[PDB]
Design a protein around this nucleic acid. Sequence first.
RNA 1: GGCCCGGGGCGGUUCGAUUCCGCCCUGGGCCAC
Length: 437
Amino acid sequence: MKVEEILEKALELVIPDEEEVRKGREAEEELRRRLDELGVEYVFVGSYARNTWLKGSLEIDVFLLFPEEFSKEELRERGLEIGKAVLDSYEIRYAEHPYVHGVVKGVEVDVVPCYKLKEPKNIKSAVDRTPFHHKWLEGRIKGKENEVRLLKGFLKANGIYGAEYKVRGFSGYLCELLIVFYGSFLETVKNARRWTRRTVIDVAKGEVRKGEEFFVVDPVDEKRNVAANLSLDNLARFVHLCREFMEAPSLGFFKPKHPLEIEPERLRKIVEERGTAVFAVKFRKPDIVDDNLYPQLERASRKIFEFLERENFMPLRSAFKASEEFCYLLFECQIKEISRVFRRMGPQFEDERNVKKFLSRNRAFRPFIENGRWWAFEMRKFTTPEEGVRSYASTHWHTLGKNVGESIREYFEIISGEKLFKEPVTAELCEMMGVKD
RNA sequence: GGCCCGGGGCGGUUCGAUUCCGCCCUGGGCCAC
């Protein structure tokens, strides 16, 4: 029931069993043949190549090596041809550049094209840095693969594994660098506890120093931060998870948390107990990829949150959720209703010039003096958050992200009350309000 | 697509805007890569 005892049973969840392992080898096997039969220069990389892949995440990455002189276009065309010829089923995919994804003997395969080079410089695209990352890692990580898996399993179970924008967590490469640095998962966890937002980990120099931000310097490129897209709050959650784990080790830290859905009735009661304004902006989800969508949801969410705060509705927290169908921007405010009149600060009494201009405005209530300066009562255009966001979203749709904003412009509604509790957002709402149990 | 930084125009808002809320062009860096 102590750390060691737990990490033992935890392996069971992160390490792939013989059947899954065999499936991958027989696949790498066949994949090899097909490529040699065309005599292509390739190099398996990624977690499959180093046996650092998490149980259930089997996927083979194959990078095709091309001469430095070949053209951008050449690589994609030939990469496509090759990928086409070797994959049972395929499907052009995209990221920095287009690439081929498919399945061989029942397993996911990625066929990426890149430039065969030597020495980190000369690099043209992040895909070229992958072989170097791989080289630096194969020798150093050998023998610690299960330590890598515990860390990945740990981060994954707590919703902070991937480095894509939907997650903003720890990339797999980062996890392997951490193991190489600390030696094991427990050592990584024990030290992470003393991590700060100013911590800088330098694998190449085997050093830990203070910086302006959390920086895990790439062994292959001292200027690149591997934890660049790890978010401040996600770094905080990890640090806090590590402290709690070392305090009360549990297998539970490696098991995915249950959705724990709730009945809209209890949710309705909670919001009533809160006395707050809970509402959502619902619009149609743009047909774009997560990497473009979620950063936009954050912006749209932030822009409106700041509108709510400068408009005095005392926002608490925000959230958002995407579906195949729609997107929801969720909000909770302390002010369900603010008055019509508010006070605008005017000039100091001595400034005759500005005072006259300030008093020249025809207002409904007659301005007054208070502690040396003039003030005026003014009337608002809206008195409820919902009412405010309807105005805001309607005229500032263009500042809520290029795609999200264009979608909001053509359609969006504001839901609240029971009507909201029926939408697919209860999970996000409970998280947002700290509903426990 | 998003984030950081820096320019040239603008609009609305305000007693007063470089500085609030936004929009055009526009140069550089970063991120998912």
